[PDB]
Amino acid sequence: YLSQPRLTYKTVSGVNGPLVILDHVKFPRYAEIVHLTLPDGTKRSGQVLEVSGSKAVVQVFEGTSGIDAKKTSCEFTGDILRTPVSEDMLGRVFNGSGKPIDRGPVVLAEDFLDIMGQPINPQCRIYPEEMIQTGISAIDGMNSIARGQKIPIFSAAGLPHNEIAAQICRQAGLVKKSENFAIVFAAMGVNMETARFFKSDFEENGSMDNVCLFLNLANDPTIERIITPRLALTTAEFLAYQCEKHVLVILTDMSSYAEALREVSAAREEVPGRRGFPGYMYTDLATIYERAGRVEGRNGSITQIPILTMPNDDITHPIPDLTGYITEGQIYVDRQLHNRQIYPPINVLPSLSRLMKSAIGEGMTRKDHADVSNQLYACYAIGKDVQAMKAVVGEEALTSDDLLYLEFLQKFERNFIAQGPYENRTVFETLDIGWQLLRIFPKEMLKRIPQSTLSEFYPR
Amino acid sequence: YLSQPRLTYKTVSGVNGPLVILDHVKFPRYAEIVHLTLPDGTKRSGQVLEVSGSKAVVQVFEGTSGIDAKKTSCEFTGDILRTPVSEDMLGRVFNGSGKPIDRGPVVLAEDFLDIMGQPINPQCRIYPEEMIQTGISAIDGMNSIARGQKIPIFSAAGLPHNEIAAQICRQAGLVKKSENFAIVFAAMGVNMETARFFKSDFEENGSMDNVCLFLNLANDPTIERIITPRLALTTAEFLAYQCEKHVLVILTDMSSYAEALREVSAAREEVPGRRGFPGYMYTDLATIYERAGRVEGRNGSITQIPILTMPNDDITHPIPDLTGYITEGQIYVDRQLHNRQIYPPINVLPSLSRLMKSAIGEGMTRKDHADVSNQLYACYAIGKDVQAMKAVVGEEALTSDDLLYLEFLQKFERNFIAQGPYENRTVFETLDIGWQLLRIFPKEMLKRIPQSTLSEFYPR
């Protein structure tokens, strides 16, 4: 118990952008929390980014407008940001800094948890092998997702990534052989109608009893987006590893978070990275993405589905690039498929799931899963490489089998990918449609499928 | 008046680039004017670019070659750059800084005017609607020009933009449905051939008691190209809004102005825009182009015709691209038409005049002007499409109408555009030529002309 009284300094010596600089601080602690009282009486909170001697450099979460350098009072807490955590947080709506925004009381704490986390021994983790049946063929069939993974959705501007996210949240369950997910949902810089969409979708499907929301809208302060994905990931860690439930964490616009990161790094005059983003953005996104999985001895898990929007549909931008080095795959939402009225517009050629090989197969889903997926992928690739020069050089110079790949292209994009915004397919229906599509080709053209599997599944 | 003595400082703190830095100045004033005397007696002039406490940063118009920090003596004027302005300035030749280069005396000033001008209240303007008849059918008939417009010539290096300019100058006048311009000519960075050409053409094809020249050549100070168009435009505003004349301002190679501007910007390490040009190039070109129009209650005007040279014939370069966002149209001079010995080599598709719709029509030129113009545009574009289709599919794969378009193209480029360098076509002759060109097609192909116009003008 910190029982000594706190110190309050009226010694501000600079305001610049999001930062306030103070002098004459007594033994400044790093990462400390500060409470600022403005001249009129309003209160804000900040976190110390750098100490040096007597100086301290606070970042204010709610902006620096209205702050002067003679009558603002900064009270130092003596401790790092520990958030209050409880199990009543399910069914409640908070803002991007954890304050109640639904006419409810403040959180009566079961515990106080550090929001930077606690490192988990790599020897105490468990490898995820339980497949999540999302009910979406493009994911289930070819990019399967294990329970405990971290797999983002690479999207763009104007595309339906919120519909895909909500459908996954609504339909996600385990592969039926014989409870369900709690949901934590952080939104960084969304508009009002996206938040309206998500709230209505959660409470119209009876889920709200089991959902915690942290909402930072585009009219809210920008520097809050830095702590928002960490209060959402500190609740998810209390529920999963202390209350032992299976949590699903959605993090909407992991691009707004990185823009706020760049905005704070540019005000500190630091050696910039690529495109101006901080040079430590990799080590910063990795402390968010790597809070997911199962641990030994505890029956809880955390699955993560971040949602990016690539600037200019560019997958080599710093944000998608660095996110790909950290997460286990990606689901790629394409614009060319959107402009042709396909939903969900998932392009399976740059999509990947790195935990699929160990979550599918005999005894888990079905013995023909991996071979069907591999052959469908190879056929789609060959068909695209055909269609290119078919459009370029000669609609009649096409060979006799260079027309089977085009018919496969059409029927695969219209029958396998295109699903329906409320349709919940099993895994075995997905596999049956895959076989119905593979039956276009004579069985001699399926080189990526063994003979024992072709003999058992092709002739029907 | 300023009745106090002037202060002279030998307190130079450091020379670097084109900037001199003075210390111990007494209440330095921003944008003030300084007179420097060098150790060998030569005299230069500069302008204060920044003040701070006792420091002033002067930018010398002639350069900093030969200045030292012990004997150069700077005398502060006490006021911003004001030019002496009169009405005898018509019929005189000055250099790019305002001194006489025609063996005459200095200007006996009627007034002293600040050369930065003053933005005109947008409520006190009059929308320009009186059409200038330049006698060039490519401008009169398709890109009509009003009296008060600002419309540049987008050319390149080696093309005949100077003769186009001089022809406009010697042919221009109002439209006669049932007295003259005073020219102000500023040239920035021209060679001696161009100045010779313009001087010879003014005093031969007209009168030279109505022209005022400001000649800054290619072997003259670069930083004095920044104040030459402002001297020209201050003279123009005095002659137009106080003596109530109709002025025509010709500013030659705004590209050299923009390049001197880039050089001064790079000298003091400011934020660049595209291709290194300063980020404030739009706000700087707009203080030059926007000093052109009419006002309420005064019987003068200012018609500006800048002349550009696009690097590599690229219209996306920063100079033409930022110029086209500020001015009310442009006249595009083409190289492909010059190589076919066509004069004037004006390509009407990338041309535009934004004040044409309000200057043509019934009671202004003639009832059918706009429809003929739009139909000529449509037919020219379709002809240029067919011309490129036939380069792939050959001469004998075209239809009966594609040959009509290919005939229109030839007759248009040789009868309408091509004019001859001393030919003055009244706008009614231009419209008759346009109708003779439109009668190539049956009246059902002319799908932009209403029927009651085709009933009156097509059969004749």
């Binding site: 005059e269 050696v271 | 390490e269 934020v271």
Partner: peptide, 18 residues
């Protein structure tokens, strides 16, 4: 280029004024 020149300018401002 411009960002690195800015960093160097701030370095050589700090070291001289301090």
């Amino acid at each position: 280029f411009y960002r690195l020149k800015k960093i160097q300018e701030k370095k050589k401002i700090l070291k001289e004024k301090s």
